[PDB]
Amino acid sequence: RFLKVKNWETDVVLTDTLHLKSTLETGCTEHICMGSIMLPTKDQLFPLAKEFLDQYYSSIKRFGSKAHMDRLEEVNKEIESTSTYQLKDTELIYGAKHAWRNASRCVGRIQWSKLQVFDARDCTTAHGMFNYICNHVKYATNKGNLRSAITIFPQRTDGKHDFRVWNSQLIRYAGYKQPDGSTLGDPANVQFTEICIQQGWKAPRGRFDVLPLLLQANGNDPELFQIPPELVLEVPIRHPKFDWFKDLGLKWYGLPAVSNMLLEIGGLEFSACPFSGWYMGTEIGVRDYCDNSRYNILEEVAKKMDLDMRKTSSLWKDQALVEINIAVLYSFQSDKVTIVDHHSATESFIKHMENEYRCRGGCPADWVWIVPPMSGSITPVFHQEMLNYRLTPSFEYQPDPWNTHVW
Amino acid sequence: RFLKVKNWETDVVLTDTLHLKSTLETGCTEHICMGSIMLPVRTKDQLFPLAKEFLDQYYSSIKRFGSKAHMDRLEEVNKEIESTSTYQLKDTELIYGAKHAWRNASRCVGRIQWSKLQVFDARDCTTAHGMFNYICNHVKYATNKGNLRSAITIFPQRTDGKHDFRVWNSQLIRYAGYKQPDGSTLGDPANVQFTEICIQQGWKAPRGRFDVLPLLLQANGNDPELFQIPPELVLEVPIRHPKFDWFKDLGLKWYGLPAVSNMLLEIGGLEFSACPFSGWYMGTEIGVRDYCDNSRYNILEEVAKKMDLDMRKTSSLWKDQALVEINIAVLYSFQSDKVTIVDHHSATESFIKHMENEYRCRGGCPADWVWIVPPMSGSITPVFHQEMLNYRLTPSFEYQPDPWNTHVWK
Numbered sequence A: 001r002f003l004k005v006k007n008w009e010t011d012v013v014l015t016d017t018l019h020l021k022s023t024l025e026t027g028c029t030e031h032i033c034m035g036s037i038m039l040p041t042k043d044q045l046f047p048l049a050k051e052f053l054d055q056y057y058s059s060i061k062r063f064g065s066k067a068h069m070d071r072l073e074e075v076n077k078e079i080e081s082t083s084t085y086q087l088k089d090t091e092l093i094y095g096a097k098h099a100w101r102n103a104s105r106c107v108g109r110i111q112w113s114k115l116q117v118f119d120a121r122d123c124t125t126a127h128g129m130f131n132y133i134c135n136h137v138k139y140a141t142n143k144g145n146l147r148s149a150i151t152i153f154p155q156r157t158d159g160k161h162d163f164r165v166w167n168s169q170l171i172r173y174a175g176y177k178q179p180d181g182s183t184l185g186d187p188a189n190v191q192f193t194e195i196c197i198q199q200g201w202k203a204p205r206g207r208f209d210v211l212p213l214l215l216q217a218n219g220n221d222p223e224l225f226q227i228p229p230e231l232v233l234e235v236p237i238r239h240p241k242f243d244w245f246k247d248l249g250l251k252w253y254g255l256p257a258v259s260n261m262l263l264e265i266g267g268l269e270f271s272a273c274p275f276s277g278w279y280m281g282t283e284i285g286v287r288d289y290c291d292n293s294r295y296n297i298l299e300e301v302a303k304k305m306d307l308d309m310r311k312t313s314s315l316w317k318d319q320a321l322v323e324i325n326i327a328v329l330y331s332f333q334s335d336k337v338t339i340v341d342h343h344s345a346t347e348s349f350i351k352h353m354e355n356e357y358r359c360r361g362g363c364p365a366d367w368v369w370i371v372p373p374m375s376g377s378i379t380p381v382f383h384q385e386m387l388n389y390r391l392t393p394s395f396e397y398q399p400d401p402w403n404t405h406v407w
Numbered sequence B: 001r002f003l004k005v006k007n008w009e010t011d012v013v014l015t016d017t018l019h020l021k022s023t024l025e026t027g028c029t030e031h032i033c034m035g036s037i038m039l040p041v042r043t044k045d046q047l048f049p050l051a052k053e054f055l056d057q058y059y060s061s062i063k064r065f066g067s068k069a070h071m072d073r074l075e076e077v078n079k080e081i082e083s084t085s086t087y088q089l090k091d092t093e094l095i096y097g098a099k100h101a102w103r104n105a106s107r108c109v110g111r112i113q114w115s116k117l118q119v120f121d122a123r124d125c126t127t128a129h130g131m132f133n134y135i136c137n138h139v140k141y142a143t144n145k146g147n148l149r150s151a152i153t154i155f156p157q158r159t160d161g162k163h164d165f166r167v168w169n170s171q172l173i174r175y176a177g178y179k180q181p182d183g184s185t186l187g188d189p190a191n192v193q194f195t196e197i198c199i200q201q202g203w204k205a206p207r208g209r210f211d212v213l214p215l216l217l218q219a220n221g222n223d224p225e226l227f228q229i230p231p232e233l234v235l236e237v238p239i240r241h242p243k244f245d246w247f248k249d250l251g252l253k254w255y256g257l258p259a260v261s262n263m264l265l266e267i268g269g270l271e272f273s274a275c276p277f278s279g280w281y282m283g284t285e286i287g288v289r290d291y292c293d294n295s296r297y298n299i300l301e302e303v304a305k306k307m308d309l310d311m312r313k314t315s316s317l318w319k320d321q322a323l324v325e326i327n328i329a330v331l332y333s334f335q336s337d338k339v340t341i342v343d344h345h346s347a348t349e350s351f352i353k354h355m356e357n358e359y360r361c362r363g364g365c366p367a368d369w370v371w372i373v374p375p376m377s378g379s380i381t382p383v384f385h386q387e388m389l390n391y392r393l394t395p396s397f398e399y400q401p402d403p404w405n406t407h408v409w410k
């Protein structure tokens, strides 16, 4: 059926048909919605490859052409002979860009077409991966003028020769469980921070220690590598009015780079495909700094501001939250490091949504993830009905490597 | 089938079995989620089974399932339906049904209070004047001079669909809205259409910024009638700030009693089209939505100016800063005038405790994440980190089309 999506702030109604092309399951049913759940053969391969190629040739205005038929049959024969196939560079680039385009949880998709794709399919060792990663980090960082990019390592074969980046993000801070029972550094990485130790790393036992890369090539055991400190751009956090802010000793990295997801293109699976863009202010100030299970710094900032913390009704938590986020955006803009505020980011997404509806007939979006973690209703996306569904190519979650690896 | 729900902040995992008793559809499919969509005369046939389900639930609740009383009631109702095409609920069943419709309301964060609902039986009402009296008594009871008490008033159920009882107002108390020929709006933009209907029906509008609308009441399917709610019964709170003396000069105020009056209460197959209910406000409803929505009073700018914030670039978060102070103002004003109100931190914390309790004693708690998470400071409230399952259980409250779109004028 043809579904319609309305914006209750502007009355604008959009009709969605793109969902009719969805193939994967959402996790919901006619009786139950699981919209807030974080994680809901040669015979299988060709139809997938066919699906992909058809849309590829359709995008290049050559659907049903000789070239299309030729390619479709070449891949077909290749699969029947090699149980798999290889994507042309042009197809790989198209696929990576569309996987981003179809990422329902990403609010920054208005940038989808500008993706720089690095073909790392000729890689064979961990030192090789380290080289490709350093180059990606340096390219995307661009002295502070961040550029979107993704590096694609060799596709899956027999499931035993998988390339995998063990880190969840190329750049993250370590976490250590102290005697006090408390946590030093980022609590979210405690476990990983230990697998590094349990592997050889020499943790400076610090609050903000950039973790090392744990690279896995061809299924072998992962190796560690220190990212050239000179390549890891960091920003000191200070408030544009509270001189005492710098005394908190807070800093964060400028390059957000997810490295544990799986890129699926035409049936082929790329288990190591780290990608990076740039931060939206709230990701750091609200989630990394204020989540109770993270650096949880609200009380500290609350105290230094001297606001009544006796009653929650004084909204001291809210007041403190705003100041921390103003500081983050100020520190990044002052160090000339790319970053976008939730107001600007959400405005762009709405524009992107309208473009996608009139050009592709729709745009899968996960409201739960798209609406910012603070000031939700004062951003335009809060009032925008959204339809979530899965389209391929796509980025998927996958089990951690240390829970499936056979040393 | 068992369904696990996890809180990523506490790692506490809960198991849901209650969904197995869900019957109504959600709108979602196995290929698409419609979780963020605002809006996703029965026959004797589909009536007794609906009646049976409810009665079994009721007798099981009082530990009398299978009792002679339980069996006799089923026979009584069956005979009634086949004999008259419908049936009448006993007072006890109505109270149980009303409380559970609230308990099952997936979009309500105030459910920890469900068992404390005061139910007023207005099923003997026959005229609009009759309805007005019942509503006035409800408003006075619930207000209780500022110490708000939850309540619901239930008018006669639907019969053939042509004698419906309806409260045309969306809320018992709301401010009028007026569109100016220059395109601007005086008052609350959200109530312009209804305000026009009221004027056309003869209401003499004072055309101000905060004029309490009159009640438009429909009884027995007849044309609706206008009634002014006694001013002395409408509790209002002047909004001021604890530190900003200029805030009060913004001339802002709001009523203390939120009273939804356009929903349909479904109990055991019976439909009650007029069932106004009220509780008390959570601060953000007024401060964030009624005052700051671009399509409502939209006071962000004026407030940001007076605070002299840097409004040249959004990156200064002047909207966020102004938003917090306005919400501080709302909470402070209500508490000072001793009118019940709850902040979002307290309300969401209570909901989490309610939800965990329900999972243990009931086996589940349907919840709509999109609606439960507050419209400001989302992630610093426990609910943001709580996975929730949304499904429909009956008794329940449902939306129904606006009466002016379906009413046959006499």
Ligand code: HEM
Residues within 6 Å of the ligand: A100, A103, A105, A106, A107, A108, A109, A111, A115, A148, A149, A150, A258, A275, A276, A277, A278, A279, A280, A283, A340, A345, A395
């Ligand atoms: C251009 C700048 C970009 C911005 C402003 C942006 C912003 C966002 C934000 C705010 C989120 C939510 C993060 C979280 O809460 O964990 C997100 C998620 C995501 N983005 Fe983007 N993004 C950008 C670039 C990218 C790129 C380059 C790709 C891939 C090629 C991408 C793929 C995704 C995916 C797959 C998710 C969901 C990840 C998950 O489930 O953890 N994004 N993005």
Ligand code: HEM
Residues within 6 Å of the ligand: B098, B102, B105, B107, B108, B109, B110, B111, B113, B117, B150, B151, B152, B260, B277, B278, B279, B280, B281, B282, B285, B342, B347, B371, B397
């Ligand atoms: C004790 C005070 C109560 C509080 C703090 C509370 C709070 C809330 C809030 C914050 C919402 C969302 C409002 C919106 O964004 O439009 C809501 C919705 C709702 N509540 Fe409660 N509530 C309370 C009492 C009640 C009562 C007495 C009932 C019924 C007997 C009830 C039934 C519902 C329903 C059905 C909805 C959804 C209405 C809609 O879809 O517009 N609530 N409540």
Ligand SMILES: N=C(NCCC[C@H](N)C(=O)N[C@H]1CN[C@H](C(N)=O)C1)N[N+](=O)[O-]
Residues within 6 Å of the ligand: A256, A257, A258, A275, A276, A277, A278, A279, A280, A283, A284
């Ligand atoms: N802006 C981002 N954001 C995505 C990565 C940063 C994000 N703030 C983060 O820490 N994501 C983690 C933590 N929670 C997610 C999960 N799925 O559990 C992954 N990416 N980009 O390429 O520009």
Ligand SMILES: N=C(NCCC[C@H](N)C(=O)N[C@H]1CN[C@H](C(N)=O)C1)N[N+](=O)[O-]
Residues within 6 Å of the ligand: B258, B259, B260, B277, B278, B279, B280, B281, B282, B285, B286, B289
């Ligand atoms: N706290 C409430 N809140 C619900 C009523 C107030 C709410 N803020 C409101 O104005 N609801 C309207 C506007 N949006 C809803 C809709 N369905 O479109 C109804 N109720 N209570 O019983 O205590």
Ligand SMILES: C[C@H](O)[C@H](O)[C@H]1CNc2nc(N)[nH]c(=O)c2N1
Residues within 6 Å of the ligand: A036, A037, A038, A368, A369, A370, B008, B384, B385, B386, B387, B388
């Ligand atoms: C339980 C709930 O799904 C979870 O807390 C989600 C909510 N929305 C989110 N939205 C974004 N962007 N990022 C997140 O990590 C989350 N967490």
Ligand SMILES: C[C@H](O)[C@H](O)[C@H]1CNc2nc(N)[nH]c(=O)c2N1
Residues within 6 Å of the ligand: A008, A382, A383, A384, A385, A386, B036, B037, B038, B370, B371, B372
């Ligand atoms: C489109 C989206 O569903 C809509 O804006 C919803 C979001 N969450 C909400 N949550 C509450 N409590 N109240 C609302 O009116 C809404 N509006």
Ligand SMILES: [Zn+2]
Residues within 6 Å of the ligand: A028, A029, A032, A033, A034, A035, B028, B032, B033, B034, B035
């Ligand atoms: Zn759903």
